[PDB]
Amino acid sequence: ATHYSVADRWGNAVSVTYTINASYGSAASIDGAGFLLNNEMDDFSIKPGNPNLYGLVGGDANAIEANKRPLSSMSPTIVLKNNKVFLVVGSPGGSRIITTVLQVISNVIDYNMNISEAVSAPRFHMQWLPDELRIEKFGMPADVKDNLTKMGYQIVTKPVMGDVNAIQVLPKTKGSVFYGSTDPRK
Amino acid sequence: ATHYSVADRWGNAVSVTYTINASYGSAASIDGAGFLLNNEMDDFSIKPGNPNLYGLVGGDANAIEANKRPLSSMSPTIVLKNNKVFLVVGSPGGSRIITTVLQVISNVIDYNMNISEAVSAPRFHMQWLPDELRIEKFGMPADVKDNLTKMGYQIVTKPVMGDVNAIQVLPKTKGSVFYGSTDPRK
Amino acid sequence: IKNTKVGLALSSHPLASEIGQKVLEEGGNAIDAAVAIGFALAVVHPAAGNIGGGGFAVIHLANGENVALDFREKAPLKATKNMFLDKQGNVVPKLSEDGYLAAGVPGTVAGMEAMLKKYGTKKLSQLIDPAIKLAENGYAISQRQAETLKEARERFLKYSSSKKYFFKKGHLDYQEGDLFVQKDLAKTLNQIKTLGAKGFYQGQVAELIEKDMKKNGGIITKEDLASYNVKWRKPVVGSYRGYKIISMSPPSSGGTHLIQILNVMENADLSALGYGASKNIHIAAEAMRQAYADRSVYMGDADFVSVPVDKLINKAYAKKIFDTIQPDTVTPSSQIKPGMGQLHEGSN
Amino acid sequence: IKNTKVGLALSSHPLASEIGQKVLEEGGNAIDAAVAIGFALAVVHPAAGNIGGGGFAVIHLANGENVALDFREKAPLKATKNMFLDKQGNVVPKLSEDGYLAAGVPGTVAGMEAMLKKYGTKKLSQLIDPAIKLAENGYAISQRQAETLKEARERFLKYSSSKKYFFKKGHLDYQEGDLFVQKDLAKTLNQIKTLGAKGFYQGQVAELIEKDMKKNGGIITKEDLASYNVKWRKPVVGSYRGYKIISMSPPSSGGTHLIQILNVMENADLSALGYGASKNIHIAAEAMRQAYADRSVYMGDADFVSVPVDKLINKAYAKKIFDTIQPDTVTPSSQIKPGMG
């Protein structure tokens, strides 16, 4: 997946995440047509309790049926403030999408980060199975890691999570100022 | 002050920090010549124990005398690895220059940050008087602040420190790759 | 990155971003620009930008309305529950990940058209030209693209089609700076330019898709393509500390768990301790843990299964989750019960 | 930012960086690019880039040798120890900060020419052209520049010269996007192009400097300008975990204390706990605390006072400092002894 965010002068916002699933999808292209096929079928549960590419599991609800759409984690999001566009945000990352996006939103609303700060801030991740707290290199100092380990977390440092392209729209004395950030991880 | 860094293909490196002292120096220009005069005299000690614009004090060593050069904190620096240029680094920031530059260097050598990571990493500062640990917004989490406060530091959050422009030079098969970073604080 | 005139169109590739921004400069609306980017990324970011996959658009309109476009891929007409299992009932390695049977029916092209038809102001012919230009004339391979292409090498090598398209003559890896030209892709894009979505889902391209599927053990045919449909849905909506959250509903789990997790977090004053505090991280991570447990049981395509969206985003459920969070201590995943005894509709 | 062929020239203003980078692309060396940047920033970054100030260049050469160039300002010939004080020793407020008496003799022009003549390959007259073009034809005020100019307004208003140069007609602040043109600066830069450093330190520019100083209670004269001298000095050198550190020596304190603080830190394995660990911050901060106390007593221009550089950068001294750093408590500043005894 890849995420893109658009906001216009009339007050429309469009948040799009789209994907062929894995990097280069299924790796097979349609001969004569020049495009790669998705491997989106792996987003179904192909057998109960079997972990997929992102360690996600399922049973009946996300089992394969003809014509059914495989469950996604894509989270293209729009945040409103006073019924005006405030944030347009999303990310790739498979299972990490949901936690990446919510962290960017929290960084703005809870911590008063600007959109650039909110996107660049280190991210953590918990997806139940595997039972680990996933973090980024340089993302969490020893004191914080120590205290979380004492709570019972198993902390693991893995490659950086996500690729947020986000817009923050702020009211100006007349009209709007549109701010954008891409992701330093990309 | 402002810092600039240059490295060429032959192994020469030039690290320059230069200044008119305060922002816009003395604020006075030479009429007919179009340039601002420095206020570098404030970098002397004008009176034993009197704190200057950066809270720095002195006595005899940094007293004013005709033709004498006022003490600076500017730290244009080059780091070599195996006698080859490795880092070219420096910053403005008055008293904070020394600690800014050393933190960028430590971040590379001690923590294996690349130059972009090393420059963007939050910075702290201790200059003895005031007896305070100066930090940046979002730069230190609660757990770390708590532990340092328990040690006896008075932690204060102040405006971001410095403006590092730095180069890292790494060997490739044919010669070298040059990586640069400007400062996100800029 | 800032603008005060036409807004912003931001993506992961600067060429695609430029394309959308241009559409805003020339008077297109956010939907118009969204369409141009969708096709541009299909050319310049083939690891993820695509016409052979699918996705979602969440849209907020100037009139205040919110809508979600589902252009997610569909399992083929002939797909079955156990299609990826062997005779012993065990997963056939890589069958769901590599090759032609791994593919759902592409939604991207139908999705781009659907949003343009309903909410755009410009013609598909105008918005697709920049993509076609990039395909026809090419672009420079980036440092990162060289890296991802190399990583995918062994996967491409399995498919004659991919060995043609994603290597240089002699099956050589593309290198940073190399010009990458995609004429077959340009041909496909020209068909969509002329005929719209029908240029992908019918006619010559559909034939190409059916042919290559039959050649390589895929099950997608012209019938699956003819049967592909987008769906307009209500986004999932919630609130967090006075802000309205609008996100993707089923068949994404994303919007629902995003809202659910924020709902849990809303019960703590995170601002008190600030970014990166272990106490704050704990509340969030335990909220995440319950949410992903819930996901494993209660989430799927709501058109086909019962999905308790409203219960999952109910703040009262989130409050029950918050109350289960033990101070200074985790609840290991082994102990987590999906739904927390709250999502039972009788013995169902 | 990445380059694999000619290197990198990096500054705080993209127009100046571009100027330096082009010098590299055209085959100039790092010194050539550094000199072009020095003049360009004097036009496009007037808060700090300058011809009316000074600074330092630390240089590592292809042949392996290191050098430092001191183009720091000098106190004028008429400067005296108590010049910013009254008869009773009271500070005269802002006298060292705002206006003409606050200025040391500028070194930047002399420093640019000196490094170019010794280590450069191109002519000053060519390397200064891009700066002159920006001065003569203008560049756009950035958002940040609009902010810093606004913040300086009350200071500029004190001096008729700055009112002329740094405001629009009617003494109005420059706004973001405005074209900022500096004709008198281009005049000054053209004297430097045509005559070298003597175009600043002698002749008409020296006349304008001396006469504006006299009008406004400054003390810089033609004699000060004619006697301005750069100094080629040995850099201060140290080591940290197998890397060689080359930095600026007196009259900067920067290289000495940088090396001293790293020397203290070297006694711990910081890598073990990693970035941002309180135990690592504590070691660095206690090292800083002692270094800045030392700075207050031992540092100045070594041409005039004794500066114990070698003792300050001695690793055994740094180890003594390290030995005093307690695991779980600070050494309060009131308890620090400069030099530790």
Side-chain angles (χ1 to χ4, degrees), chain A residues 1-171 173 175-186, chain B residues 1-173 175-186, chain C residues 1-122 124-348, chain D:
Chain A
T2 193
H3 184 82
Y4 60 90
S5 295
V6 192
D8 70 28
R9 73 173 184 87
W10 294 277
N12 306 298
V14 181
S15 195
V16 181
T17 324
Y18 82 154
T19 188
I20 45 176
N21 188 21
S23 183
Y24 304 98
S26 73
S29 314
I30 295 298
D31 197 33
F35 69 90
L36 290 152
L37 291 162
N38 71 82
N39 59 353
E40 226 72 56
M41 296 299 285
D42 192 68
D43 275 2
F44 282 115
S45 177
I46 71 178
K47 171 171 167 175
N50 173 256
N52 78 347
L53 274 173
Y54 311 104
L56 294 164
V57 295
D60 293 331
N62 187 38
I64 299 162
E65 312 173 54
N67 309 130
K68 184 173 181 183
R69 300 159 200 259
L71 189 69
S72 183
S73 307
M74 290 182 288
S75 304
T77 301
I78 298 170
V79 181
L80 306 189
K81 180 179 63 160
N82 302 316
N83 305 334
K84 295 205 198 320
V85 177
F86 178 64
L87 303 174
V88 188
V89 59
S91 182
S95 54
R96 287 90 59 178
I97 290 170
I98 303 170
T99 61
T100 285
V101 176
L102 77 89
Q103 280 171 96
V104 170
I105 293 168
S106 176
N107 286 344
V108 176
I109 294 170
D110 298 309
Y111 308 132
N112 285 145
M113 292 195 194
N114 63 42
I115 196 58
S116 185
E117 290 165 334
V119 167
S120 67
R123 288 158 196 173
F124 61 87
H125 175 69
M126 162 55 70
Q127 64 173 64
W128 170 67
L129 301 176
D131 187 353
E132 65 183 29
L133 185 64
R134 174 174 176 163
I135 65 162
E136 302 180 310
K137 212 190 182 178
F138 316 126
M140 185 172 285
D143 303 56
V144 175
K145 296 195 286 200
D146 287 350
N147 285 339
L148 289 164
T149 300
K150 274 291 180 203
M151 299 193 198
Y153 290 108
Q154 169 58 58
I155 301 168
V156 63
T157 297
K158 293 184 159 175
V160 296
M161 289 177 279
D163 182 5
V164 173
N165 296 305
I167 296 164
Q168 183 176 28
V169 189
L170 299 179
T173 58
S176 295
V177 184
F178 297 80
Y179 295 93
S181 183
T182 58
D183 201 316
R185 293 167 183 77
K186 160 198 83 185
Chain B
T2 197
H3 182 76
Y4 60 93
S5 297
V6 188
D8 68 28
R9 87 193 85 174
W10 302 290
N12 303 292
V14 185
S15 195
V16 184
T17 321
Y18 81 150
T19 189
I20 45 170
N21 192 22
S23 185
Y24 303 102
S26 73
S29 302
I30 295 304
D31 203 6
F35 69 87
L36 284 156
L37 291 160
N38 72 86
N39 58 352
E40 224 75 59
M41 298 296 284
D42 192 66
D43 277 1
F44 281 116
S45 174
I46 70 172
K47 186 179 169 176
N50 180 75
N52 79 348
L53 285 168
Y54 313 106
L56 294 166
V57 298
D60 294 318
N62 191 36
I64 299 160
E65 198 171 333
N67 297 146
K68 190 177 174 179
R69 297 167 198 254
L71 185 69
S72 184
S73 299
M74 296 187 281
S75 307
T77 302
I78 297 173
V79 183
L80 308 179
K81 173 172 172 165
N82 299 119
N83 267 308
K84 289 202 212 319
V85 177
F86 178 62
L87 296 171
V88 190
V89 61
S91 187
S95 58
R96 289 89 57 182
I97 287 170
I98 304 168
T99 60
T100 283
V101 170
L102 79 89
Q103 283 172 96
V104 176
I105 299 173
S106 173
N107 285 345
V108 175
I109 293 167
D110 294 307
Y111 309 134
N112 201 38
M113 296 196 189
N114 69 39
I115 196 60
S116 179
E117 291 167 329
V119 166
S120 67
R123 288 162 194 162
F124 59 91
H125 174 72
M126 164 54 73
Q127 68 177 60
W128 163 72
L129 294 174
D131 185 349
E132 66 181 31
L133 189 62
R134 173 176 179 159
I135 65 167
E136 300 179 319
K137 196 187 183 199
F138 317 123
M140 182 175 288
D143 304 53
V144 171
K145 287 202 263 195
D146 283 353
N147 286 330
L148 290 169
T149 295
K150 283 172 182 143
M151 290 188 199
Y153 290 106
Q154 175 71 340
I155 295 169
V156 294
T157 302
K158 289 178 162 179
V160 292
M161 290 177 276
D163 184 4
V164 175
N165 296 298
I167 300 165
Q168 180 167 37
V169 186
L170 305 181
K172 51 169 184 144
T173 317
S176 301
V177 53
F178 301 81
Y179 294 97
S181 184
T182 62
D183 200 315
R185 294 161 182 82
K186 209 212 295 168
Chain C
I1 315 165
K2 59 163 186 176
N3 190 284
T4 52
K5 192 171 146 203
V6 289
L8 284 174
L10 299 186
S11 80
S12 288
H13 197 296
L15 292 180
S17 295
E18 183 161 37
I19 287 165
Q21 193 67 221
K22 261 71 211 172
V23 169
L24 295 178
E25 283 155 31
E26 307 173 304
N29 68 14
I31 289 85
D32 294 319
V35 169
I37 293 175
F39 286 110
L41 289 172
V43 180
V44 295
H45 190 21
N50 66 92
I51 63 172
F56 304 104
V58 171
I59 302 168
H60 170 84
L61 299 164
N63 70 359
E65 294 198 2
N66 313 294
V67 297
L69 185 57
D70 161 357
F71 58 97
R72 182 62 160 181
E73 299 98 307
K74 294 163 67 192
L77 292 161
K78 291 198 184 70
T80 57
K81 183 186 71 173
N82 301 324
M83 68 190 283
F84 298 112
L85 311 181
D86 66 23
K87 55 175 177 175
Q88 298 188 319
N90 287 322
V91 166
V92 176
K94 294 301 185 180
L95 193 55
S96 74
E97 297 184 42
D98 295 351
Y100 292 72
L101 201 62
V105 183
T108 292
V109 176
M112 295 301 106
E113 186 177 86
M115 64 172 165
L116 194 67
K117 287 204 196 296
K118 196 184 265 219
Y119 294 119
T121 66
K122 290 180 161 169
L124 186 48
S125 255
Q126 277 79 98
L127 298 172
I128 203 168
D129 281 325
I132 296 163
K133 206 180 177 197
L134 286 164
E136 296 201 281
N137 299 145
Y139 63 95
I141 296 288
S142 67
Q143 176 196 310
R144 181 61 193 163
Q145 287 179 337
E147 284 162 17
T148 62
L149 288 166
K150 182 169 190 174
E151 280 154 22
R153 183 188 173 83
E154 320 304 312
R155 296 182 73 217
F156 291 144
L157 287 162
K158 290 181 287 223
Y159 309 106
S160 68
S161 56
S162 299
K163 287 182 282 195
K164 173 163 59 177
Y165 295 138
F166 296 96
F167 300 126
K168 307 190 284 201
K169 196 177 176 169
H171 296 140
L172 302 189
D173 294 328
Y174 276 97
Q175 302 301 332
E176 183 192 349
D178 286 351
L179 181 66
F180 188 50
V181 171
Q182 302 173 85
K183 283 171 89 173
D184 281 6
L185 183 61
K187 198 155 80 168
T188 300
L189 293 164
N190 269 301
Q191 292 259 40
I192 304 157
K193 172 177 167 75
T194 311
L195 306 167
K198 295 190 189 197
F200 183 93
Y201 296 96
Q202 290 166 217
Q204 300 181 284
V205 181
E207 296 285 4
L208 286 166
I209 296 167
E210 178 179 300
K211 176 180 187 159
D212 215 24
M213 288 276 172
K214 280 170 75 199
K215 185 156 197 280
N216 295 284
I219 59 166
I220 294 167
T221 71
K222 283 192 283 180
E223 201 188 312
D224 305 74
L225 294 163
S227 292
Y228 186 86
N229 57 328
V230 307
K231 301 204 178 188
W232 294 96
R233 316 177 179 271
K234 300 181 87 148
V236 287
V237 167
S239 67
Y240 186 66
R241 310 194 201 284
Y243 292 81
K244 188 168 153 176
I245 309 303
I246 306 151
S247 194
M248 191 59 210
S249 48
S252 191
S253 67
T256 295
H257 300 310
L258 180 129
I259 289 167
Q260 175 186 10
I261 297 167
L262 294 169
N263 282 343
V264 180
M265 291 160 59
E266 200 177 33
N267 290 284
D269 178 13
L270 302 186
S271 81
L273 291 170
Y275 173 80
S278 63
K279 281 191 172 165
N280 284 358
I281 296 168
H282 172 240
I283 297 310
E286 295 308 291
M288 290 167 186
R289 191 196 299 278
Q290 183 67 56
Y292 283 87
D294 289 354
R295 189 189 191 277
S296 73
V297 171
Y298 296 104
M299 277 282 163
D301 186 348
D303 294 353
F304 286 78
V305 302
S306 297
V307 179
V309 167
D310 293 334
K311 286 164 175 285
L312 283 165
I313 65 178
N314 192 327
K315 286 182 192 291
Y317 178 51
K319 168 62 173 161
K320 294 172 191 290
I321 295 169
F322 180 77
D323 293 341
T324 66
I325 298 171
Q326 303 311 307
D328 202 59
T329 172
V330 302
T331 300
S333 295
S334 65
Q335 302 305 296
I336 295 289
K337 305 300 181 283
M340 296 214 320
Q342 308 309 301
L343 299 182
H344 299 283
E345 43 173 53
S347 63
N348 285 341
Chain D
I1 300 174
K2 177 192 173 192
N3 189 282
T4 59
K5 36 137 223 219
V6 304
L8 283 178
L10 294 177
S11 81
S12 289
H13 199 299
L15 293 172
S17 300
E18 180 177 43
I19 283 164
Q21 193 66 211
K22 188 172 204 167
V23 170
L24 295 183
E25 294 170 359
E26 279 157 18
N29 71 19
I31 290 85
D32 298 314
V35 170
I37 291 176
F39 289 108
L41 288 168
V43 181
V44 296
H45 188 19
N50 68 88
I51 60 173
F56 305 103
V58 171
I59 297 165
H60 172 88
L61 303 161
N63 73 353
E65 289 175 344
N66 304 296
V67 298
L69 175 66
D70 164 1
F71 57 99
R72 182 68 160 177
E73 297 97 314
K74 293 163 69 187
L77 283 157
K78 292 176 197 162
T80 54
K81 182 172 173 282
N82 298 326
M83 66 188 289
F84 294 111
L85 313 184
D86 66 18
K87 177 81 174 187
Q88 295 81 25
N90 307 307
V91 170
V92 182
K94 290 186 195 280
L95 194 59
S96 70
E97 297 178 10
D98 286 2
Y100 291 75
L101 197 62
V105 186
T108 293
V109 178
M112 291 307 115
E113 183 186 77
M115 62 174 154
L116 186 64
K117 288 198 156 194
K118 194 155 185 171
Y119 299 116
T121 69
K122 292 177 167 180
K123 298 186 178 288
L124 184 42
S125 180
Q126 275 65 77
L127 296 170
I128 200 165
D129 283 334
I132 296 171
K133 178 178 200 202
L134 287 157
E136 185 69 24
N137 299 307
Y139 62 94
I141 297 296
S142 65
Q143 178 193 318
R144 179 58 185 154
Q145 283 179 342
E147 295 164 353
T148 64
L149 290 162
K150 180 176 183 192
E151 287 174 8
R153 172 167 187 93
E154 298 304 323
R155 298 181 74 219
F156 288 149
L157 281 171
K158 299 184 181 191
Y159 314 104
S160 69
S161 55
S162 299
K163 288 165 49 167
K164 179 156 74 197
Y165 295 132
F166 294 96
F167 296 139
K168 304 186 292 196
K169 192 188 188 196
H171 313 303
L172 291 161
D173 305 310
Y174 276 94
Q175 299 305 339
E176 181 180 356
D178 282 355
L179 190 69
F180 183 41
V181 178
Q182 298 177 93
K183 301 291 196 183
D184 283 359
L185 183 58
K187 282 192 192 187
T188 303
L189 295 173
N190 273 296
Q191 292 280 45
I192 297 157
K193 174 185 170 63
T194 293
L195 300 169
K198 61 191 232 158
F200 181 90
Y201 292 99
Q202 297 178 53
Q204 170 69 317
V205 168
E207 168 76 2
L208 295 168
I209 294 166
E210 175 176 272
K211 268 56 197 195
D212 206 24
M213 279 279 165
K214 187 198 179 199
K215 186 196 173 212
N216 292 282
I219 58 168
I220 293 172
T221 62
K222 288 182 188 182
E223 186 181 5
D224 284 311
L225 293 160
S227 58
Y228 184 83
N229 58 317
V230 303
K231 290 196 57 154
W232 289 102
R233 310 191 181 261
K234 292 178 177 195
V236 60
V237 172
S239 67
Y240 186 66
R241 310 197 201 279
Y243 293 87
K244 181 174 200 164
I245 311 292
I246 312 286
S247 193
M248 188 64 212
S249 46
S252 189
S253 69
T256 298
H257 298 309
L258 166 63
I259 288 170
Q260 174 186 3
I261 295 163
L262 288 171
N263 283 343
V264 175
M265 291 167 60
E266 201 176 33
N267 292 282
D269 179 10
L270 303 180
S271 81
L273 291 171
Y275 171 79
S278 62
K279 290 284 200 179
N280 289 355
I281 296 160
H282 175 53
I283 292 158
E286 284 300 335
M288 296 169 182
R289 193 194 302 271
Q290 181 71 53
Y292 281 89
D294 291 348
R295 189 190 188 275
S296 75
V297 171
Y298 298 111
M299 281 279 168
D301 184 349
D303 293 355
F304 287 77
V305 310
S306 290
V307 187
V309 178
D310 288 344
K311 297 173 188 311
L312 288 170
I313 70 173
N314 186 334
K315 280 181 190 297
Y317 180 53
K319 183 61 163 59
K320 284 177 188 52
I321 299 168
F322 183 74
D323 290 343
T324 72
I325 303 174
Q326 309 302 299
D328 69 1
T329 203
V330 297
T331 303
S333 293
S334 62
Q335 299 307 292
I336 293 286
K337 305 182 179 194
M340 318 218 296

